[PDB]
C-alpha cells in the first residue's frame, strides 16, 4: 500500500550500497525525470542521506 | 528575439563522447541512453540530441 498526498512517506536510507541500475534499466516504470544530476552517473557518485 | 518564436536556434543537449577542439558535428542520429538498442526515430532512452 502507498499513502496518498495527505501523509507522504519519508523513508530514510543510509549505510548501504545503492544499485540504481535496476531501477534505471527497468521497463516497469512510466516516467523517470531529473536534471539535478545526470542519471547515468548516479551509481559512482556517493551520498550521505 | 521574436515574440512569435525564433526557435530555429538549435543546440546539442548531450553527446556520446566529448569532441576534440575545433571539431564541428552535424549528425542528428538518435542517441541511446540505456541497454535496449535504439530502434526507430523515438523509443525508450532514445531522444533527439
Short mmCIF file of N, CA, C and O in Angstrom, two decimals:
data_model
loop_
_atom_site.label_atom_id
_atom_site.label_comp_id
_atom_site.label_asym_id
_atom_site.label_seq_id
_atom_site.Cartn_x
_atom_site.Cartn_y
_atom_site.Cartn_z
N UNK A 1 0.83 -1.20 0.00
CA UNK A 1 0.00 0.00 0.00
C UNK A 1 0.87 1.25 0.00
O UNK A 1 1.90 1.31 0.68
N UNK A 2 0.44 2.25 -0.77
CA UNK A 2 1.09 3.56 -0.82
C UNK A 2 0.09 4.62 -0.37
O UNK A 2 -1.01 4.70 -0.91
N UNK A 3 0.49 5.42 0.61
CA UNK A 3 -0.37 6.50 1.07
C UNK A 3 -0.41 7.62 0.04
O UNK A 3 0.53 7.84 -0.72
N UNK A 4 -1.53 8.34 0.02
CA UNK A 4 -1.70 9.45 -0.91
C UNK A 4 -0.98 10.68 -0.37
O UNK A 4 -0.19 10.60 0.58
N UNK A 5 -1.25 11.84 -0.96
CA UNK A 5 -0.52 13.06 -0.63
C UNK A 5 -0.88 13.60 0.75
O UNK A 5 -0.22 14.55 1.22
N UNK A 6 -1.89 13.04 1.42
CA UNK A 6 -2.25 13.54 2.74
C UNK A 6 -1.12 13.32 3.74
O UNK A 6 -0.83 14.19 4.57
N UNK A 7 -0.47 12.16 3.68
CA UNK A 7 0.66 11.82 4.54
C UNK A 7 1.65 11.03 3.68
O UNK A 7 1.55 9.81 3.56
N UNK A 8 2.60 11.74 3.08
CA UNK A 8 3.55 11.15 2.15
C UNK A 8 4.72 10.54 2.91
O UNK A 8 5.31 11.19 3.79
N UNK A 9 5.06 9.30 2.57
CA UNK A 9 6.12 8.58 3.25
C UNK A 9 7.48 9.25 3.02
O UNK A 9 7.79 9.67 1.90
N UNK A 10 8.28 9.29 4.08
CA UNK A 10 9.56 9.99 4.11
C UNK A 10 10.66 9.02 4.52
O UNK A 10 11.40 9.27 5.48
N UNK A 11 10.75 7.89 3.82
CA UNK A 11 11.66 6.83 4.24
C UNK A 11 13.11 7.32 4.25
O UNK A 11 13.54 8.07 3.37
N UNK A 12 13.85 6.89 5.27
CA UNK A 12 15.25 7.24 5.45
C UNK A 12 16.13 6.09 4.98
O UNK A 12 15.89 4.94 5.34
N UNK A 13 17.15 6.41 4.18
CA UNK A 13 18.08 5.41 3.68
C UNK A 13 19.50 5.90 3.94
O UNK A 13 19.86 7.02 3.57
N UNK A 14 20.30 5.05 4.58
CA UNK A 14 21.70 5.35 4.85
C UNK A 14 22.42 4.05 5.19
O UNK A 14 21.78 3.03 5.49
N UNK A 15 23.75 4.10 5.15
CA UNK A 15 24.61 2.97 5.50
C UNK A 15 24.26 1.74 4.67
O UNK A 15 23.87 0.69 5.18
N UNK A 16 24.41 1.88 3.35
CA UNK A 16 24.15 0.79 2.42
C UNK A 16 24.72 1.17 1.06
O UNK A 16 25.05 2.33 0.81
N UNK A 17 24.84 0.17 0.19
CA UNK A 17 25.26 0.36 -1.19
C UNK A 17 24.02 0.36 -2.06
O UNK A 17 23.18 -0.54 -1.97
N UNK A 18 23.89 1.39 -2.90
CA UNK A 18 22.69 1.61 -3.70
C UNK A 18 22.99 1.29 -5.15
O UNK A 18 23.90 1.88 -5.75
N UNK A 19 22.22 0.37 -5.73
CA UNK A 19 22.35 0.00 -7.14
C UNK A 19 21.17 0.60 -7.88
O UNK A 19 20.10 0.00 -8.00
N UNK A 20 21.37 1.82 -8.41
CA UNK A 20 20.33 2.49 -9.17
C UNK A 20 20.15 1.91 -10.56
O UNK A 20 19.21 2.32 -11.26
N UNK A 21 21.01 0.99 -10.99
CA UNK A 21 20.90 0.43 -12.33
C UNK A 21 19.60 -0.34 -12.51
O UNK A 21 18.97 -0.28 -13.58
N UNK A 22 19.18 -1.09 -11.49
CA UNK A 22 17.97 -1.90 -11.60
C UNK A 22 16.76 -1.02 -11.88
O UNK A 22 15.97 -1.31 -12.79
N UNK A 23 16.60 0.06 -11.12
CA UNK A 23 15.51 0.99 -11.38
C UNK A 23 15.73 1.76 -12.68
O UNK A 23 14.76 2.14 -13.34
N UNK A 24 16.99 1.98 -13.05
CA UNK A 24 17.30 2.76 -14.25
C UNK A 24 16.99 1.98 -15.52
O UNK A 24 16.53 2.55 -16.51
N UNK A 25 17.24 0.67 -15.51
CA UNK A 25 17.11 -0.17 -16.69
C UNK A 25 15.92 -1.13 -16.56
O UNK A 25 15.99 -2.29 -16.97
N UNK A 26 14.82 -0.64 -15.99
CA UNK A 26 13.61 -1.43 -15.83
C UNK A 26 12.49 -0.81 -16.65
O UNK A 26 12.31 0.41 -16.64
N UNK A 27 11.73 -1.65 -17.35
CA UNK A 27 10.62 -1.21 -18.18
C UNK A 27 9.30 -1.16 -17.41
O UNK A 27 8.26 -0.87 -18.02
N UNK A 28 9.32 -1.43 -16.11
CA UNK A 28 8.12 -1.44 -15.28
C UNK A 28 7.81 -0.07 -14.68
O UNK A 28 7.15 0.01 -13.64
N UNK A 29 8.27 1.01 -15.32
CA UNK A 29 8.03 2.36 -14.82
C UNK A 29 7.52 3.23 -15.96
O UNK A 29 7.79 2.97 -17.13
N UNK A 30 6.79 4.28 -15.59
CA UNK A 30 6.18 5.16 -16.58
C UNK A 30 7.09 6.35 -16.91
O UNK A 30 7.48 6.54 -18.06
N UNK A 31 7.43 7.15 -15.90
CA UNK A 31 8.25 8.33 -16.10
C UNK A 31 9.42 8.33 -15.13
O UNK A 31 9.33 7.83 -14.01
N UNK A 32 10.53 8.93 -15.58
CA UNK A 32 11.76 8.98 -14.79
C UNK A 32 12.47 10.28 -15.16
O UNK A 32 13.16 10.34 -16.19
N UNK A 33 12.29 11.31 -14.34
CA UNK A 33 12.75 12.65 -14.69
C UNK A 33 13.58 13.26 -13.56
O UNK A 33 13.18 13.20 -12.39
N UNK A 34 14.73 13.82 -13.93
CA UNK A 34 15.57 14.62 -13.04
C UNK A 34 16.75 15.25 -13.77
O UNK A 34 17.47 14.57 -14.52
N UNK A 35 16.95 16.55 -13.56
CA UNK A 35 18.04 17.30 -14.19
C UNK A 35 19.12 17.72 -13.21
O UNK A 35 20.16 18.23 -13.64
N UNK A 36 18.91 17.52 -11.90
CA UNK A 36 19.91 17.95 -10.93
C UNK A 36 21.24 17.25 -11.12
O UNK A 36 22.30 17.84 -10.88
N UNK A 37 21.21 15.99 -11.54
CA UNK A 37 22.41 15.23 -11.85
C UNK A 37 22.05 14.20 -12.90
O UNK A 37 20.95 13.65 -12.90
N UNK A 38 22.98 13.96 -13.82
CA UNK A 38 22.73 13.02 -14.90
C UNK A 38 22.50 11.62 -14.33
O UNK A 38 23.33 11.13 -13.55
N UNK A 39 21.40 10.95 -14.68
CA UNK A 39 21.09 9.65 -14.06
C UNK A 39 22.10 8.56 -14.39
O UNK A 39 22.14 7.55 -13.68
N UNK A 40 22.90 8.73 -15.44
CA UNK A 40 23.86 7.69 -15.81
C UNK A 40 24.92 7.49 -14.74
O UNK A 40 25.31 6.36 -14.44
N UNK A 41 25.40 8.59 -14.14
CA UNK A 41 26.49 8.53 -13.17
C UNK A 41 26.00 8.59 -11.72
O UNK A 41 26.74 9.03 -10.85
N UNK A 42 24.76 8.15 -11.46
CA UNK A 42 24.28 8.11 -10.09
C UNK A 42 25.07 7.12 -9.24
O UNK A 42 25.40 7.41 -8.08
N UNK A 43 25.38 5.95 -9.80
CA UNK A 43 25.99 4.88 -9.01
C UNK A 43 27.38 5.28 -8.51
O UNK A 43 27.71 5.03 -7.35
N UNK A 44 28.19 5.88 -9.38
CA UNK A 44 29.56 6.22 -8.98
C UNK A 44 29.58 7.31 -7.92
O UNK A 44 30.39 7.25 -6.98
N UNK A 45 28.71 8.31 -8.04
CA UNK A 45 28.68 9.40 -7.07
C UNK A 45 28.03 8.93 -5.78
O UNK A 45 26.96 8.33 -5.79
N UNK A 46 28.70 9.20 -4.66
CA UNK A 46 28.23 8.76 -3.35
C UNK A 46 27.40 9.85 -2.68
O UNK A 46 27.39 11.01 -3.10
N UNK A 47 26.71 9.46 -1.60
CA UNK A 47 25.84 10.38 -0.88
C UNK A 47 25.82 9.99 0.59
O UNK A 47 26.31 8.92 0.98
N UNK A 48 25.26 10.87 1.41
CA UNK A 48 25.19 10.66 2.86
C UNK A 48 23.81 10.22 3.33
O UNK A 48 23.70 9.21 4.04
N UNK A 49 22.76 10.94 2.96
CA UNK A 49 21.40 10.59 3.38
C UNK A 49 20.51 10.51 2.15
O UNK A 49 20.67 11.29 1.22
N UNK B 1 15.59 38.20 -31.15
CA UNK B 1 14.45 37.78 -30.35
C UNK B 1 13.14 38.12 -31.04
O UNK B 1 12.94 39.25 -31.50
N UNK B 2 12.25 37.14 -31.12
CA UNK B 2 10.96 37.28 -31.79
C UNK B 2 9.86 36.75 -30.89
O UNK B 2 9.98 35.66 -30.31
N UNK B 3 8.78 37.52 -30.77
CA UNK B 3 7.67 37.12 -29.90
C UNK B 3 6.96 35.89 -30.47
O UNK B 3 6.41 35.08 -29.71
N UNK B 4 6.95 35.73 -31.79
CA UNK B 4 6.32 34.56 -32.39
C UNK B 4 7.09 33.28 -32.20
O UNK B 4 6.53 32.19 -32.39
N UNK B 5 8.37 33.37 -31.83
CA UNK B 5 9.19 32.21 -31.59
C UNK B 5 10.18 31.94 -32.69
O UNK B 5 9.84 31.35 -33.72
N UNK B 6 11.42 32.37 -32.49
CA UNK B 6 12.51 32.10 -33.43
C UNK B 6 13.32 30.89 -32.96
O UNK B 6 14.51 30.97 -32.66
N UNK B 7 12.65 29.74 -32.93
CA UNK B 7 13.24 28.53 -32.37
C UNK B 7 14.04 27.73 -33.39
O UNK B 7 14.20 26.52 -33.22
N UNK B 8 14.53 28.38 -34.45
CA UNK B 8 15.47 27.73 -35.36
C UNK B 8 16.86 27.62 -34.76
O UNK B 8 17.71 26.92 -35.33
N UNK B 9 17.12 28.27 -33.62
CA UNK B 9 18.40 28.17 -32.93
C UNK B 9 18.42 26.86 -32.16
O UNK B 9 17.78 26.73 -31.11
N UNK B 10 19.16 25.88 -32.67
CA UNK B 10 19.20 24.55 -32.08
C UNK B 10 20.60 24.25 -31.55
O UNK B 10 21.59 24.81 -32.02
N UNK B 11 20.66 23.39 -30.54
CA UNK B 11 21.94 23.07 -29.91
C UNK B 11 21.89 21.66 -29.35
O UNK B 11 20.82 21.10 -29.09
N UNK B 12 23.08 21.09 -29.16
CA UNK B 12 23.22 19.71 -28.70
C UNK B 12 22.97 19.64 -27.20
O UNK B 12 23.65 20.32 -26.42
N UNK B 13 22.00 18.81 -26.80
CA UNK B 13 21.78 18.58 -25.37
C UNK B 13 22.86 17.69 -24.78
O UNK B 13 23.36 17.96 -23.68
N UNK B 14 23.25 16.64 -25.49
CA UNK B 14 24.19 15.66 -24.98
C UNK B 14 24.76 14.85 -26.13
O UNK B 14 24.14 14.74 -27.20
N UNK B 15 25.94 14.28 -25.91
CA UNK B 15 26.69 13.58 -26.94
C UNK B 15 27.29 12.32 -26.34
O UNK B 15 27.49 12.23 -25.12
N UNK B 16 27.56 11.34 -27.20
CA UNK B 16 28.13 10.07 -26.74
C UNK B 16 29.48 10.29 -26.06
O UNK B 16 29.76 9.70 -25.01
N UNK B 17 30.33 11.13 -26.65
CA UNK B 17 31.63 11.43 -26.07
C UNK B 17 32.01 12.86 -26.42
O UNK B 17 31.56 13.40 -27.44
N UNK B 18 32.84 13.47 -25.58
CA UNK B 18 33.25 14.84 -25.80
C UNK B 18 34.09 14.96 -27.06
O UNK B 18 34.88 14.06 -27.39
N UNK B 19 33.92 16.06 -27.78
CA UNK B 19 34.60 16.27 -29.05
C UNK B 19 35.91 17.01 -28.85
O UNK B 19 36.07 17.80 -27.92
N UNK B 20 36.85 16.74 -29.76
CA UNK B 20 38.14 17.41 -29.74
C UNK B 20 37.99 18.86 -30.18
O UNK B 20 36.99 19.22 -30.81
N UNK B 21 38.95 19.72 -29.85
CA UNK B 21 38.81 21.15 -30.19
C UNK B 21 38.66 21.37 -31.69
O UNK B 21 39.29 20.69 -32.50
N UNK B 22 37.80 22.33 -32.03
CA UNK B 22 37.52 22.69 -33.42
C UNK B 22 37.05 21.49 -34.24
O UNK B 22 37.50 21.26 -35.36
N UNK B 23 36.13 20.72 -33.67
CA UNK B 23 35.54 19.55 -34.33
C UNK B 23 34.04 19.77 -34.41
O UNK B 23 33.30 19.46 -33.47
N UNK B 24 33.58 20.31 -35.54
CA UNK B 24 32.16 20.51 -35.75
C UNK B 24 31.45 19.17 -35.92
O UNK B 24 32.00 18.22 -36.48
N UNK B 25 30.21 19.10 -35.43
CA UNK B 25 29.39 17.91 -35.55
C UNK B 25 28.01 18.31 -36.05
O UNK B 25 27.38 19.23 -35.50
N UNK B 26 27.53 17.63 -37.09
CA UNK B 26 26.23 17.91 -37.68
C UNK B 26 25.29 16.72 -37.62
O UNK B 26 24.10 16.87 -37.95
N UNK B 27 25.76 15.55 -37.21
CA UNK B 27 24.92 14.36 -37.19
C UNK B 27 23.74 14.54 -36.24
O UNK B 27 23.86 15.16 -35.18
N UNK B 28 22.59 14.00 -36.65
CA UNK B 28 21.36 14.06 -35.86
C UNK B 28 20.86 12.67 -35.52
O UNK B 28 19.66 12.46 -35.35
N UNK B 29 21.77 11.70 -35.41
CA UNK B 29 21.39 10.34 -35.07
C UNK B 29 20.86 10.28 -33.64
O UNK B 29 21.41 10.91 -32.73
N UNK B 30 19.79 9.52 -33.45
CA UNK B 30 19.17 9.40 -32.13
C UNK B 30 20.11 8.64 -31.20
O UNK B 30 20.56 7.53 -31.52
N UNK B 31 20.42 9.24 -30.06
CA UNK B 31 21.31 8.62 -29.09
C UNK B 31 20.53 7.71 -28.14
O UNK B 31 19.37 7.98 -27.80
N UNK B 32 21.18 6.63 -27.72
CA UNK B 32 20.59 5.66 -26.81
C UNK B 32 21.26 5.78 -25.45
O UNK B 32 22.48 5.71 -25.35
N UNK B 33 20.44 5.94 -24.41
CA UNK B 33 20.92 6.08 -23.04
C UNK B 33 20.46 4.92 -22.17
O UNK B 33 20.11 5.09 -21.00
N UNK B 34 20.45 3.71 -22.73
CA UNK B 34 20.03 2.54 -21.99
C UNK B 34 20.54 1.28 -22.65
O UNK B 34 21.20 1.31 -23.70
N UNK B 35 20.23 0.15 -22.02
CA UNK B 35 20.68 -1.14 -22.53
C UNK B 35 19.96 -1.53 -23.82
O UNK B 35 20.56 -2.16 -24.69
N UNK B 36 18.69 -1.17 -23.94
CA UNK B 36 17.93 -1.53 -25.13
C UNK B 36 18.51 -0.84 -26.36
O UNK B 36 18.94 0.32 -26.29
N UNK B 37 18.56 -1.52 -27.51
CA UNK B 37 19.01 -0.86 -28.73
C UNK B 37 18.05 0.24 -29.15
O UNK B 37 16.84 0.15 -28.93
N UNK B 38 18.60 1.29 -29.74
CA UNK B 38 17.79 2.44 -30.14
C UNK B 38 17.19 2.15 -31.51
O UNK B 38 17.88 2.19 -32.53
N UNK B 39 15.89 1.86 -31.54
CA UNK B 39 15.19 1.48 -32.75
C UNK B 39 14.17 2.56 -33.11
O UNK B 39 13.43 3.03 -32.24
N UNK B 40 14.14 2.94 -34.38
CA UNK B 40 13.20 3.94 -34.85
C UNK B 40 13.63 5.34 -34.48
O UNK B 40 14.68 5.59 -33.89
N UNK B 41 12.77 6.30 -34.86
CA UNK B 41 13.04 7.70 -34.56
C UNK B 41 13.01 7.94 -33.06
O UNK B 41 13.86 8.65 -32.51
N UNK B 42 12.03 7.35 -32.37
CA UNK B 42 11.87 7.55 -30.94
C UNK B 42 11.74 6.20 -30.25
O UNK B 42 11.38 5.19 -30.86
N UNK B 43 12.04 6.20 -28.95
CA UNK B 43 11.96 4.99 -28.16
C UNK B 43 12.40 5.29 -26.74
O UNK B 43 12.78 6.42 -26.40
N UNK B 44 12.34 4.26 -25.90
CA UNK B 44 12.78 4.40 -24.52
C UNK B 44 14.27 4.67 -24.48
O UNK B 44 15.06 3.95 -25.10
N UNK B 45 14.66 5.72 -23.76
CA UNK B 45 16.04 6.21 -23.70
C UNK B 45 16.56 6.63 -25.07
O UNK B 45 17.77 6.72 -25.28
N UNK B 46 15.66 6.89 -26.02
CA UNK B 46 16.01 7.38 -27.35
C UNK B 46 15.44 8.79 -27.48
O UNK B 46 14.22 8.97 -27.53
N UNK B 47 16.32 9.78 -27.55
CA UNK B 47 15.92 11.18 -27.64
C UNK B 47 16.68 11.86 -28.76
O UNK B 47 17.81 11.50 -29.09
N UNK B 48 16.04 12.86 -29.36
CA UNK B 48 16.70 13.67 -30.37
C UNK B 48 17.77 14.51 -29.69
O UNK B 48 17.47 15.26 -28.75
N UNK B 49 19.03 14.43 -30.13
CA UNK B 49 20.11 15.12 -29.41
C UNK B 49 20.11 16.63 -29.57
O UNK B 49 20.97 17.30 -28.99
#
